[PDB]
Amino acid sequence: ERSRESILDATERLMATKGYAATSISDIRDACGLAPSSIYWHFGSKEGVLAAMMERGAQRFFAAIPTWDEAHGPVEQRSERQLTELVSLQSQHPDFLRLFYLLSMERSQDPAVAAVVRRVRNTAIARFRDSITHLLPSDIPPGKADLVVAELTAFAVALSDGVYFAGHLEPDTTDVERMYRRLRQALEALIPVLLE
Amino acid sequence: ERSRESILDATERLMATKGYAATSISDIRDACGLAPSSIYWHFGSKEGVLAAMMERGAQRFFAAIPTWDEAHGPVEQRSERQLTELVSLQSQHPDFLRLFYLLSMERSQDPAVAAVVRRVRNTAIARFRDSITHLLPSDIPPGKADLVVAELTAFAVALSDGVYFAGHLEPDTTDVERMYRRLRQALEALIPVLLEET
Ligand code: NA
Ligand code: NA
Ligand code: NA
């Protein structure tokens, strides 16, 4: 819908400017022109707006990174982009990232929000899993591979989570590209260890 | 002195139940018997209390792990309980940890809170750095060591941050001990890599 996008657009700018608490459903109307009843009719509530806002922020973050089959090149890589995008995709668009980590720790969470948080986290995990499976030798038995891949994935996701906070808490001295370089180097080193 | 402790104790329990939002200065009095005016006089405000409580939780988290110099004797070398002490304390807090990440991302928060967050983060970084220096060969030129230790530390702290969220978002399938073992193994692998790159 054209109207759904209007609301989210307004909600982004308003919360960026005023923060969550001080952003009214009324304010959102003032910005997007849509009446509160129309807003409620779409997202059901303020939290329902926040969720949908946060989700499509994810959908764009992930689309800006190609999957492994979205490639291209003779397995250049198939790092290239995947790290390069991930690197550039932390440049003051954590945005959605900060919101994610905030919402992940929220207590007594609205169902719509908890569902969005879960889908985003699962997606991120799935995406790392897609890349990492290609770091293993092909002659590894699939069941054994599943265990190794799952453990490397959990490791990478953890490190990537840490990268946001490093950039947030130590923005001056943090090198995002360098850190993800150490990650892939760490993963390549851990593969022989895991198969032992 | 004893008054500060009973205020924080009451504030913990009240904030374990109830939400931060729904915990009033009034409620805190009801629990600890100290008047609101006495509470303010100590911590200055509600978020002023929140800070002090979160810091105290960190100081206890950090004391529960030894520094390299105070650790044992030299066998482990000194790490594998500094490991399990780190593993001991997840266990999935707060205590402090969830509050820390929440407060670290809070906007326009409060001078006293931002200071606590900064001290806790810096301490944790300092603690990892203290351990990691002994992973390097003795003959590395100090200035070059400083660069390598710093990069390994940033890496370790990042991984440790992610370990919390793994345990939070995937509590069923997350092995905390196994993860910190992979961190140690990763750090040992990265040391030669870092030294040949200066
Ligand atoms: Na209108
Ligand atoms: Na309308
Ligand atoms: Na040595």
For residue A147, how many other CB atoms are within 10 A of its CB?
Answer: 11
DSSP 8-state code for residue A133: G
Ligand 3 ion: residues within 5 Å (CB): B 137-138
Q: Locate A43 and state its tokens.
A: 């997202």
In chain B, how many domains are there? Answer: 1
DSSP string, B159-180: HHHHHHHHHHH-TTT--HHHHH
Instruction: Please state, in angstroms and rounded to a whole number, the distance separating the CA atoms of residues A110 and A114.
Output: 6
The residues near A13 (Cβ < 8 Å, ≥ 6 apart) are A31
10 Å CB burial of residue A158 (0-12, 13-18, 19+) is buried
The residues near A82 (Cβ < 8 Å, ≥ 6 apart) are A65, A66, A68, A131
Decide: B189 and A189 in contact? Cβ < 8 Å: yes
Phi, psi for residue A86 in degrees, rounded to 5: -50, -40
Residues of chain A with Cβ-Cβ distance to B120 below 8 Å are: none
* Structure solved via: X-ray
Q: Locate B60 and state its tokens.
A: 């206890």
For residue A134, give its domain range: 1-196
- Determine if the peptide bond prior to B42 is cis (ω within 30°): no
A151/B182 CB distance under 8 A: yes
Q: Which amino acid is at A33?
A: G
Distances (CA, A) of B79 to A32, B66, B135, B184: 57, 10, 10, 9
Q: Locate A86 and state its tokens.
A: 């991930």
Phi, psi for residue B182 in degrees, rounded to 5: -65, -30
Nearest residue of chain A to residue B155 (CA atoms)? A179
Instruction: Please state, in angstroms and rounded to a whole number, the distance separating the CA atoms of residues A127 and A137.
Output: 19
Decide: A7 and A45 in contact? Cβ < 8 Å: no
The alpha carbon of A164 is separated from its chain's Cα centroid by a whole number of angstroms, namely: 11
Q: Which amino acid is at B150?
A: A
Instruction: Please state, in angstroms and rounded to a whole number, the distance separating the CA atoms of residues A51 and A104.
Output: 12
Dihedral sign computed on CA atoms, order A65, A70, A74, A75: positive
Instruction: Please state, in angstroms and rounded to a whole number, the distance separating the CA atoms of residues B183 and A145.
Output: 20
Query: What is the three-class DSSP state of A45?
Result: coil
Q: How far apart are the first and last CA of chain B?
A: 50
- Residues of chain B whose C-beta is under 8 A from some C-beta in A? 19, 98, 101-102, 104-105, 107-108, 121, 151, 154-155, 157-163, 165-166, 168-170, 174, 178-179, 182, 185-186, 189-190, 193
Side-chain half-sphere exposure of B101, counting CA atoms within 13 A = 28
Instruction: Please state, in angstroms and rounded to a whole number, the distance separating the CA atoms of residues A163 and A176.
Output: 7
Q: Which amino acid is at B109?
A: Q
For residue A36, how many other CB atoms are within 10 A of its CB?
Answer: 12
Decide: A157 and A125 in contact? Cβ < 8 Å: yes
**CATH number for the domain harbouring residue B155:** 1.10.357.10
Rounded (10°) CA dihedral A151, A153, A154, A156: 120
DSSP 8-state code for residue B105: T
- Say how many residues make up chain B: 198
Nearest residue of chain B to residue A94 (CA atoms)? B105
Q: How far is the CA of A119 from the centre of ligand 3 (A)?
A: 47
Nearest residue of chain A to residue B17 (CA atoms)? A107
Q: Locate A134 and state its tokens.
A: 């290609």
Alpha helices in chain A (DSSP H): 2-18, 25-32, 36-43, 46-63, 80-88, 96-104, 111-132, 142-169, 176-195
DSSP string, B115-149: HHHHHHHHHHHHHHHHHHGGGS-TTS-HHHHHHHH
- Closest CA of chain B from A6, distance in Å: 25
Instruction: Please state, in angstroms and rounded to a whole number, the distance separating the CA atoms of residues A91 and B168.
Output: 26
Q: Locate A103 and state its tokens.
A: 């919402």
For residue A46, how many other CB atoms are within 10 A of its CB?
Answer: 17
The alpha carbon of A1 is separated from its chain's Cα centroid by a whole number of angstroms, namely: 24
- Residues of chain A whose C-beta is under 8 A from some C-beta in B? 19, 98, 101-102, 104-105, 107-108, 121, 151, 154-155, 157-163, 165-166, 168-170, 173-174, 178-179, 182, 185-186, 189-190, 193
For residue B122, how many other CB atoms are within 10 A of its CB?
Answer: 12
DSSP 8-state code for residue B67: -
Phi, psi for residue B107 in degrees, rounded to 5: -105, 145
User: Can you tell me which residue has the tokens 């509470």?
Assistant: B39
Decide: B121 and B101 in contact? Cβ < 8 Å: no
Q: Which amino acid is at A165?
A: F
Instruction: Please state, in angstroms and rounded to a whole number, the distance separating the CA atoms of residues A61 and A65.
Output: 7
